[PDB]
């Protein structure tokens, strides 16, 4: 189940961002399909709660090539809520840059691009501080809500 994580990590600027994958001062695009050869690390798509996306092909068959074959892709469109709620996904590209995808913010009350449910809050997930180092001092709040019928328990990181 570990092969399903893309590992095209190209630390070209000598920043050491790949290290925390094994074990801070400087502090939209539509989620369709991304090529795994540009991804380094886990891909978290944000339904009301966070979910892990693994390397698959175009049909959706899971691949176990660490995201190296050019046919490897991430089907972010297939993870969308059918009821049409807010949606977004984040990941890290080969050179240590956090990438986001989601719906354009229709207003200040609407959601952001990544895990930004609010322009102030952020969905907590195991790799939040790796993709977003500046949110370390954010406060966590436990959240319960019904979206499209499903219950969703998750934590949000706000100022």
């Amino acid at each position, epitope marked *: 189940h*570990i*092969n399903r994580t*893309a*590992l*095209n*990590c*190209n*630390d*070209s600027l*000598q920043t*050491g961002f*790949i*290290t925390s994958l*094994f*074990y801070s001062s400087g502090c939209p695009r539509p989620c369709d399909v991304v090529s795994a050869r540009t991804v*380094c690390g886990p891909v978290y798509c944000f339904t009301p709660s966070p979910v892990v996306v693994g390397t698959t092909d175009k049909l959706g068959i899971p691949t176990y*090539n*660490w*995201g*190296e074959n050019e046919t490897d892709v991430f089907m972010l469109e297939s993870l969308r809520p059918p009821t049409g709620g807010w949606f977004g996904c984040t990941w890290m590209n080969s050179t240590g840059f956090t990438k986001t995808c989601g719906a354009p913010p229709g207003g200040p009350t609407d959601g952001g691009s990544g895990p930004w449910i609010t322009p102030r809050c952020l969905v907590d997930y195991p790799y939040r501080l790796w993709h977003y180092p500046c949110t370390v001092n954010f406060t966590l709040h436990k959240v319960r809500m019904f979206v499209g019928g499903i219950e969703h328990r998750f934590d949000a990181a706000c100022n």
Partner: antibody
Amino acid sequence: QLLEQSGAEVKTPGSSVRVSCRPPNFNSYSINWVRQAPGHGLEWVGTFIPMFGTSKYAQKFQGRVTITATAYMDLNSLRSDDTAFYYCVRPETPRYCSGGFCYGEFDNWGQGTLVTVSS
Amino acid sequence: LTLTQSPGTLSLSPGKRATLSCRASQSVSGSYLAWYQQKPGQAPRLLIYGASNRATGIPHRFSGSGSGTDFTLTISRLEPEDFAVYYCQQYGSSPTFGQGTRVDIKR
């Protein structure tokens, strides 16, 4: 600042050596092994990354070396060409990953270990 | 990939500047080059990593530069300790080493 390795050994041709590597909190992502014949430069014996369980080896060594994990390295079918000093390296920061390996600069070297193949 | 160092031996006096050259047979893509020194009867010490960046604890007189096929290690002022063998290493592809460069006292 030098990692502890197993003592020097003399082995007959065709035998097998097992050299160890001892960590000194400690952080490292892989186990490397660099060897140097008497009067030669550095050669890269294989690597082994424990978090992913994958490993690479060189063409000359592919048929008789494995590296596992304190880390260990074993050579079989020894010939006189394998007379060399063998260092283990546990580097800290990976720079280039490409599924399912990660390449970086050798960081924390061991003291070394002499292996002499002589009957 | 093949790393060719030049020259085989470098002959300088204490205080002069050393410039060692490492030339790759193929481009090192995103520069993943390292420099090591080996004193007689000692384990190698990492001097320079990632082309230009200096390793922690390494004195400021050591400097690395270069990109593509041609890389360079520079010792601005040679101290008595620096006279040793220096290896350049590429970790962009399968790890490879170049043959050393001996730095001895000129006379």
